[PDB]
Design a protein around this ligand. Structure first.
Ligand SMILES: CC(C)(COP(=O)(O)OP(=O)(O)OC[C@H]1O[C@@H](n2cnc3c(N)ncnc32)[C@H](O)[C@@H]1OP(=O)(O)O)[C@@H](O)C(=O)NCCC(=O)NCCS
Ligand SMILES: CC(C)(COP(=O)(O)OP(=O)(O)OC[C@H]1O[C@@H](n2cnc3c(N)ncnc32)[C@H](O)[C@@H]1OP(=O)(O)O)[C@@H](O)C(=O)NCCC(=O)NCCS
Ligand SMILES: CC(C)(COP(=O)(O)OP(=O)(O)OC[C@H]1O[C@@H](n2cnc3c(N)ncnc32)[C@H](O)[C@@H]1OP(=O)(O)O)[C@@H](O)C(=O)NCCC(=O)NCCS
Ligand SMILES: Cc1cn([C@H]2C[C@H](O)[C@@H](COP(=O)(O)OP(=O)(O)O[C@H]3O[C@H](C)[C@@H](N)[C@H](O)[C@H]3O)O2)c(=O)[nH]c1=O
Ligand SMILES: Cc1cn([C@H]2C[C@H](O)[C@@H](COP(=O)(O)OP(=O)(O)O[C@H]3O[C@H](C)[C@@H](N)[C@H](O)[C@H]3O)O2)c(=O)[nH]c1=O
Ligand SMILES: Cc1cn([C@H]2C[C@H](O)[C@@H](COP(=O)(O)OP(=O)(O)O[C@H]3O[C@H](C)[C@@H](N)[C@H](O)[C@H]3O)O2)c(=O)[nH]c1=O
Ligand SMILES: [Cl-]
Lengths: 186, 186, 186
């Protein structure tokens, strides 16, 4: 069938805000829903995790198995941004260098958590099995390929691939005009 | 212990067809069972997702977290094909180029979904964390490595790796002799 | 909210041994708890799988989606080791070469399972979306970057990346003084 909440059960979750035509899987996890807000026409699929401060506009699909670790600073997606399956977005990560201790079992004073808001601008697409690390803006109209890793802010309207990513090609801007056409008839 | 459904629970599912000794996780998601056939001696683990048209033969393991998105055209596996953990197989995929809007929140006329049957032939093995794209015939006896990305059909009896995959060596065919012998015991 | 067991429900799983302050998601899967041991201050998140023989010490996070397939020979992590999200550790994998049949639907005669203990020593961290294969000792202090693949044992206090991994730099050892200072103030 499908595993989505009814519009009725959504209201019971306690989101900061949730628009219309919001389909969220019952097999997703939602932690601290009072700091999570969703526009209209959002779909979030089985085995996703939203945890902490996350904000999603409208016309966004968060595909299956995707984790959004919004922490305190948060993750924000703008309209028409989509995220394919099995992606992680971190707004916070532990320091790997060996200069600090690590992870939730250890108190803050021994760790060196790197944290910064993450933003996906309008029309961003994030390819399957990718990772986005903290304190990064993914530019307007940016496509990130499958299995790619992003550690820095990405320039608008390009397609990036690889670990860590590299620019390979301009993204076509035809979507801008299609979005105007779509909005019209809606 | 294990999380597999009963023969009794399995029949309650409504599969287009289910064979014998089928072990399906209660923690998998099965969408539109009505279009899904499974032969004999098949195991499907936790957190898999089968959605839309998916045909599976016999002697096949779909390991944990693997998503098979058959859509309309479908995904087929021949006998002795196996898929290791956290793989995605897409029978349909959105246009990443920027020539078109994307994903299930948006109507089809604004999109440009690529679709085509995906076929895994006999003795195919797909390594963990791999991705197969639409309209791809994975040749008989092909092995694709961990973390593989497959956008195009793959010639029989080869080992491939990488993103996207390249052909690194031949697969031996000794496995065909062992199939014939296994069958002759059985 | 959070999705962990109370310390009461923990005792009802029948681990070879569970310590105190042990947070385990109800959305995780635990097979054969009889051969699994867990020290103290350990968190195991949603959609993890622990199957067969698994030994975790103290001060360890096993992040979401992570799968530890310990089979019979086992996976052992020492204290202050952590695994980030969507990692797989295998103590047994099947032969990809074509010399043998594959997976849990086939009798052992016809297979050529590679087995070998996996050990992660003190302060190891494994980055997200990584894979560690059988018979590998990850030396004390090792860091493996995200989206990496490990088929061989790794030297102490080095940072490794890639598929399969290459050494890129020394790990800083300030973490050795920090554990001292932290353990003391307790
Ligand atoms: C990123 C992508 C769009 C590029 O496809 P393309 O426009 O057809 O370009 P090509 O396949 O010609 O690749 C161009 C270069 O990028 C490399 N490349 C392509 N995809 C890559 C990836 N995901 N990671 C690393 N390298 C990649 C190719 O090797 C090639 O390298 P070269 O120039 O050195 O030969 C596509 O490869 C991809 O990753 N799609 C992801 C689809 C997806 O995740 N869908 C989720 C459901 S909507
Ligand atoms: C692909 C695989 C079979 C190759 O192993 P191998 O035949 O033992 O070959 P090697 O390890 O010598 O590697 C051959 C070349 O391919 C590369 N390579 C190997 N595995 C690769 C992978 N998964 N991704 C990218 N490259 C890989 C090596 O770098 C080497 O490159 P070079 O010739 O340019 O140096 C193995 O690496 C693998 O990926 N196994 C997957 C195991 C799995 O997914 N198991 C699930 C549980 S059953
Ligand atoms: C491994 C890691 C610590 C390296 O970071 P760094 O020390 O800042 O090193 P740099 O980013 O300058 O990269 C050094 C080299 O490694 C390459 N590289 C870095 N990380 C890589 C990775 N994960 N895979 C493949 N290559 C990688 C870089 O391209 C660069 O190569 P070059 O010398 O050929 O240019 C980091 O990139 C990483 O993977 N962190 C994972 C964090 C994680 O998984 N967190 C989970 C939540 S806590
Ligand atoms: C994955 C999933 C599916 N379902 C149900 C409801 C859905 O309408 C139905 C089928 O959805 P589906 O995801 O199989 O098919 P689509 O509705 O076409 O969606 C998908 O294909 C596109 C081409 C990709 N770009 C998407 O990333 C991919 O997830 O099954 C759920 O209820 N929950 C889920 O998590
Ligand atoms: C993963 C999984 C396991 N189980 C139960 C039933 C099983 O008999 C038992 C142990 O299964 P396991 O999958 O850990 O181990 P195996 O049955 O040996 O299979 C595994 O190792 C092989 C070498 C790989 N080729 C497989 O891909 C891997 O999944 O646990 C479940 O009930 N559901 C599951 O999803
Ligand atoms: C992921 C997850 C979270 N939770 C709840 C209880 C937790 O205390 C709360 C916060 O968990 P969280 O994982 O969103 O956030 P943190 O407690 O900061 O943990 C995370 O950020 C760090 C920088 C990383 N090193 C970790 O690997 C990452 O998972 O949400 C659960 O109940 N179950 C879960 O699986
Ligand atoms: Cl996953």
């Amino acid at each position: 069938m499908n595993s989505f909440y009814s519009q009725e059960e959504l209201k019971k979750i306690g989101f900061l805000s949730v628009g219309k035509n919001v389909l969220i899987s019952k097999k997703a996890s939602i932690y601290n829903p009072g700091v999570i807000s969703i526009g209209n026409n959002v779909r979030i699929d089985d085995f996703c995790i939203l945890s902490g401060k996350v904000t999603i506009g409208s016309y966004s699909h968060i595909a299956a198995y995707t984790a959004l670790y919004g922490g305190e600073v948060g993750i924000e997606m703008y309209d028409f941004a989509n995220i394919a399956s099995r992606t992680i977005v971190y707004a916070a990560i532990d320091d790997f260098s060996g200069n600090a201790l690590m992870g939730p079992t250890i108190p803050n004073q021994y760790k060196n958590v790197k944290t910064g808001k993450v933003i996906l601008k309008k029309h961003v697409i994030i390819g399957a099995h990718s990772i986005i690390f903290p304190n990064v803006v993914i530019g307007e109209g940016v496509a990130v390929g499958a299995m790619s890793m992003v550690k820095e802010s990405l320039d608008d309207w390009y397609i990036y691939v690889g670990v860590p990513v590299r620019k390979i090609k301009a993204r076509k801007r035809k979507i801008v005009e299609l979005e105007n056409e779509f909005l019209k008839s809606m």
